[model samples]
Target: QTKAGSLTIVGTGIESIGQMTLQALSYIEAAAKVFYCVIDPATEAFILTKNKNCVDLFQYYDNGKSRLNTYTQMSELMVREVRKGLDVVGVFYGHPGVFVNPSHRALAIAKSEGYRARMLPGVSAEDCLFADLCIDPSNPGCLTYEASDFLIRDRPVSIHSHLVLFQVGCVGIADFNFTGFDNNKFGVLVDRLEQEYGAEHPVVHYIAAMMPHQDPVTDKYTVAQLREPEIAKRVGGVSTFYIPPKARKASNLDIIRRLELLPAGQVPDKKARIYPANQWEPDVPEVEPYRPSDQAAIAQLADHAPPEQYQPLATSKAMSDVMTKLALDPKALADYKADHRAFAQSVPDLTPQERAALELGDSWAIRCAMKNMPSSLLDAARESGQNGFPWVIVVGV
Candidate 1:
């Protein structure tokens, strides 16, 4: 008899050993089989203890092959086991969904086929970057782009905001390189940056600390220096770069002239979110400078849940699509308004919570139009929603 299978995707974090969340570890230990692509030895050894049915996903990589094809195979490998009714978990280092295509694909495939799937959060390198750099991303705003993809898209460089380039070493290369790639591959990238910020703009080379005892590496270089071969290799492969703003954005003088209300010289005390006298503790604590030494104590330390904050209700692809149908199609809306239960029951793979929401729907129909649909049905629906740039959820904060 075939049993029901479910899929859970989780991350080991950039600092895999210390940063693995309790919930993620719980799922990894409980799963019948685990599929993972991790670069850390401590994490691999620890996971071996939790489950022996582990498969190394890095075996799919082929030198000089397209990553898209590799990702497709990886997705299929996990989906294949889910079809066999095995409880499977896919693990990737540094937030599974961040820069990870296969995890998202596998989850989507599983849900569309009516199987349970969810992803748990995990710390990422960018999370470490903010802490180690002592910078608040919300203050200046931050943007992320993969090096090769950024160059290919010819994305406009915002000199007023922070820009992070992931995989900054191999900016031109697409295929896997076993040993290393040529440092000269970054020449074009340096040229692009030079055009935007000139040759002297400061660029920070950052490699987050991988081990518990190690400190993160940060080196500053200019665009002209990064163009040099020796300088390029020194900061090459498995490294990221942070390009802070060259200048602050200028306030619009034209808009100021037409303003109905002028800025008051006196600071408004009541409207201020944070003042010296009424300061609250920072939301994110400082990263532990050193790993706790005691073996028993570190594992036993309790983690605190985030304090009360506003978080919007999260929706899934299956639920979002169902809501879209109920809102966009009057036929479905009328059927649901007539009697919610049977209409919702006919919709595929919606949870009780989603069914309940569908019963009370109509307001977010416009929102649902921007969500999921089956592959065949999705063929044309993707073309209809180009009114403006769609807002994507930041899953890996």
Candidate 2:
């Protein structure tokens, strides 16, 4: 029997050419249509060499546009091609399913529409993080979360486990723009960590190397140092924050007794190891503040606003509808804007204050107004044409 139209998602790993898995490479090479969104040019060129049908999903990204919209468009394009009976493959950098929303969305939509779909695991930043940090997840266990989600919710933290927070660079940001240094939002995260782990606790700012032979950038600072304006500048969009626990929790003697691994009063080797606050040291070298060179380019693009004629600050309804459509389907918002008069007519209710905020592109106000909004919708609003949310991963030792 002939195989039906299908969709297979694959990851290009952090360092696309070197770290990508063999299975991912095979799928990309064999697919009838390949769609990719990667960070580096070498990887893009590499995909072009292997498949002539490769489509660049990055084309959908606009500087001031909502990332949610970009992902929706990408998914729509992939799904549309799949419906035409073509074997479509989506290639994303890092673990395809880890932070790549469009890939997951595309797969879900395709399968619901009667197509075969599956995802293949690829190397993720976390994988590289584990390797470069040399800290075994099994030793102390680990807890992970997206920086923004951690701040906005009441997620339980286990002091015995190491904590990892992704996208610490752009916390509290909801719209797509590249102006760096959100010290205020970053400070909120610092305050939260200080409350949990104490002000003197050590933390590491880490960014995995994207190319072979490049050392992963690692910087160390006390929890208090993170609040300093200078330290905030060290964080880039790609930064990940690591916090080692100050001490281990009390041993679970009941579980040990039930397993009969030791005498009633005997010490168990499986007990979590405790490290003193001052004694903890990272395996990676402590370096000065490291900022990527490409950050300037990112800031430059983010600073670019639409022409003056299109810069009208929006009204309450205009802003609300913009966010709602951004949450629902970004393409509709994009299409609406394509026809200026139609877009203006659709959002006719705006106060002077709302118009000024919209004109200024006040993402903070936009995010606050969307407090009651669904997470998926919020995600669309906050997505910055970069990687997906920094997912929370808690691994039991």
Candidate 3:
């Protein structure tokens, strides 16, 4: 028995028959059997027109059967036909390599059984998203994961790139028995997302249109809003969840510096750069960074000055002279108590000429004491300078 000829899986793009690839269309026309499972009705009708041995495998989908079983049956059917020497072409919506498990599974089984099997790339929903929304994944970066896979694995979401989660309607439902959407797990998913990105970050729910003339359904909401019944109402066949980046840490300051937005030597303040204040909670400054160190010296000076001299001394002490003047004060020597605030504020604010006169009298008395005056006589001279009493210093005490 000679070996059978092979199989080629192709894509029908996201748009209707008008967006079908010419290569895919040619393969569909030339094949002996065309097995299709496109979500769009127009693509199915177009495939039916191209081949007589066409089968819509989606009819095998049972209300209670797991989707995994459906793919297994679909793969078996395509491989059986390929074994019978038929030139099989399986058409899937978007790129056949994209979400379709049967296309890859059937191709694997066919090639393993001594048949030539290959897949041709087709325009995907992501390609349509790029064209329609003017998004370039390469520029800003992008992430795409099956919604169930994302939720099941607790996938780490990259807040720096654009995100797309498909089949959100069926996420977190273990069994396929229920047809109505299970959004109960949505709150858990949102909490996980909030642990990384903040609660207020905006996320877009996108649904590409099945009809060529209609626009894609786009629902704009924050990640926090997914719990709302209104969000579930926006769900559709083509719906995909998208999250824009929150602020994130970058590896280098060089890139930001090149943009002239940050200084070259300094790292970008990541907290402020990625998500603007309007996009997240406002930030507060640390209090300790602004406190002054000179306050300690001012307090010590006020505690040590003598009662009578405390007023003038406290008011006249410069920050630099505080320790020296405090060491000389009588209250410090005798360890007498003093009112620090009164000592600080009691002295009259003096003019520059008055300050000069006070300094001259003190310097003259100090000079007279150094000239070998007796301790008691030096005390008399100090008192004389205060009350204008004239006196000569006694040499012997």
Candidate 4:
């Protein structure tokens, strides 16, 4: 039998390097052809090292080209290669299927054409937003929209729920420039937002860091302030506009009475299942190639992180490896407390940044460094109960 053609849609998470999963990397390495569209040149170069046959799919994009047409071309190109009977891996920034076009189109076409096709989940910009902004989408509810779609569709955005508008920098524009961002139409979005969120309601422009040592953009502005030339000038090609809720809505007493738990005009209690620990309980700056200011800061951090190197997969895994060891070996935890470097040295492929994260007991760096910190590892980190350990790095449907 001939080696067959198959499509594996892989993700690179948000970070350029360690954000890629081991499984994703394997497919990338083994694929006869790897075509990718990632946020940063660093990620593009990283994928190139995995498979020399790798091609930057970004080449298809051109100034003034319709975004949809570009996507169709990219997806069709993948089909052309797959028809050649070569193992094809289409890699993308963040999760391949999450808010992505080409990967989905390719996989659908390939599968319908009777080829094996599947997608591997990876962290998304939304995932990064949740972490960096410290938000729980489910607390109330979350609504996300592509900026142009949000306006064109006249979306019924609620002021009480988290509203996220990505690709805001390109709202109302159908094409892109190769050299710089086109946010000239941003005022249109500002007008639309102001109607729902009021002129004074705050909005945050967020951009996830493309590399480990870089800081993400977290600039805040009001709907009115967003109209300022200074503020609008800062909106880049890949910004996520976040609107925090204005107010919490009142509960429906009618529903409460219908449930019959609380009496008429009475309120419910939280002592039942609200807290369950035998007592029951329930839960930057900027860098260039990314943002304003930071060569020195990044260089300083890189003294430990090393030259332009991404943390290896094992480095990404070491955080969980140590947690597993600490959970499985109590003495290891105590041992680590005595000398973090001693324990850090034992973990396989532990990068300097990873070791430093464990040594200082700072998980913020760990989470940031390990952009797509494995689902299982997240559980283990929380189970370990270490102070500052991440308990709720959300990933799901």
Candidate 5:
């Protein structure tokens, strides 16, 4: 009397027989028939030695044949043996449940037809990655995706945590054939990445080797360097792409607001947070030492200058003959004083437009003053901006 058959799918971990689970080994030895897709050649031999009836399904794959076809055939073969009332065991390398579609599909189909089927847990590549990378998911969090699927779908990516992209070597190909490695797809992947993150961002090309003597390869390069000379010769099978986080931590204002620290538009006063300056703070470099005669002249001008109180200076010539020469022409002086007064009166209560105009004028004055201004003046400006202007403006201006 023929009874309905059962199916069990199990794993031979990365190191094959050395790491095979006791339960997985039991199924392999006890099953009436075994259909195996163990990746390493050594594992295939080990399984066959355990059971003479064990079959290797790798023979069904071709160099250029579509992989979908291969999986369909593998699914049918296992289901056929099960239908015949034979207790069938399906074995795969790494984990039977991870990245192995046929085993999962076969189990689902077998159970759907009223046959008993289940899968046992096995160590997967991700498990190894977590251990080898020494990454703690609880710390900053982690994300994983298939490389081509990530690219084509253009998923929203986080720039603040770990990103792992698997199967980078087989990107953009719908079929499963390992005839040769495609370097062309690497360029396509690079372009897709550029659209997501600008060119200067860093990325890593990673590969995990299964054998003992082989070293796991990790090549670090900027996104701009992906098309460099080393990529074609270096990137290979088992490769994963590790893109590290870009932005470092800064206070999230929205999060702060939600916590009731402040209202949305409110900002903490920058001056309240500043450390007080000490006399020991580095002295600013002077352009020219103070001259008594120049001091007297500025004292005279400070009283006579149309603006009531002149801005104080450590050295009087900072409002130099050159500056006074530029500002003292009767026509230009009147125009400048009128413009300053008009600008002041223009914003009784500073509007956004007035604020923008004020910032533009201030930046322009800083630009001109920094050109030949003494380091002491630059230091004063730095103190006013709290951190100084952008270094490019400081250096270039």
Candidate 6:
């Protein structure tokens, strides 16, 4: 029997050099074979220095070929080498797990075939964005999606949080041809954003520096500017789009009360309270909450779970029709409550479960359905909640 092989995946980070983690570098150095698909020439050169046996996977990419097929081929190549009992290492740009399909696919196949496979973390474009833009994801949270997927899926845009769209320049193109640029689909993206944030909303087009000494590119534009032909012409295939939140949602007073941060029925006051030195008390108790014998409760809940074979409500044809309609025309579902009964009736093949799920305005059921739908349809359906914006209208040029 052939010796059991192993696979390790690493990231070169966003920059050409210095951003690689020591652990990743060690794996690359020691691997019998290394495969890489980095964008920057400097990073490619640096990898070759560490392992002379390194192979560039980009060579397999052909013009006008399906990107998905290219990824599959790359994965197959790595799997073939790994099955040869060679310790293989795959290097990719940015975080290995971020947008790398081949790395994950190969690792999954390797694990399934009884080989040791693992991935290492590395800095990503988002890391550079946080540093360069001075935005904290925790403050308002962040929603990240691919630009094409976001438009196609009609993902709900949270005006209260930051939005980061990747691959803005490659909107509708599914193939790997790199010559010409077509950004007509960007108009649909602009139209969608205008519905929530208006044409005047400020957006940023960002490109991270590929080399250590180079400054990152940051271009500011209004939502309307993104629709301009000249602006689209300037966008690179890998450029990212960022939109700041329009406003923050109000804090929940009920949550404050539940946490007992303030006294019962006490309202917040702007003025600072004064207390005598002797009367001052610590706001919070140091002791943590105590619980006794929770194992039985946990076991009971765990035992009551249904079988894994059960399909979700979103799996119904009615739910799928709802998602498709929303993806194709967001405005049609704007007043979902007013239109839901009629809409549910229109889906001729809907079962009683699906009809009830829609009629009852079951948010959880709708979410489950959204998960089952295509990427383009999932977001729009999800964003159509009680507090979401009016349905956006998208038109192809």
Top candidate when judged by TM-score against the true structure: 2
Clashes of each: 0, 2, 0, 6, 1, 7
lDDT of each: 0.75, 0.73, 0.66, 0.75, 0.67, 0.75
List the candidates' TM-scores in order: 0.65, 0.67, 0.62, 0.66, 0.60, 0.66
- Candidate 1 per-residue C-alpha lDDT over 84-146 given as tens digits, one digit per residue, 9 for 90 to 100: 998899999989988888999999999999887899889988998887876667645788999
The parts of candidate 4 lying over 4 Å away from their true place are 1-3, 258-260, 263-265, 268-397
Residue 344 deviation, candidate 4, in Å? Answer: 36
Off by over 4 Å in 6: 1-3, 263-397
Q: Cα deviation in Å at residue 138, candidate 5?
A: 2.6
Question: Candidate 5, residues 6-121: lDDT per residue as tens digits?
Answer: 89899988764676887788778778999998667777777888787988888888877888899999999999999999889999888888777899889999989988798988
Best by lDDT: 4
> CA lDDT of 199 in candidate 5?
89
TM-score: the better of candidates 2 and 4: 2
Measured with C-alpha atoms, the lDDT of residue 18 in candidate 2 is: 93
Q: Candidate 3: global Cα-lDDT?
A: 0.66
Model 6, span 1-397: residue lDDT tens: 3357888888988888888877778778778999998888888888888887988998887788888999999999999989998889999888999967899999999999998788888999898888777666765678999877887788888977788888878778877765655666777777887888888888888998887888988888888887788886788766888888776456578777787777556653422222211111113124322334345566678559654433334375656767666544424554564577876776677767677667767666655544443554444456545344234554210
Segments in model 1 whose C-alpha atoms lie over 4 Å from true places: 1-3, 252-397
lDDT pick, better of 2 and 3? 2
Ranked candidates (TM-score, high to low):
2, 4, 6, 1, 3, 5
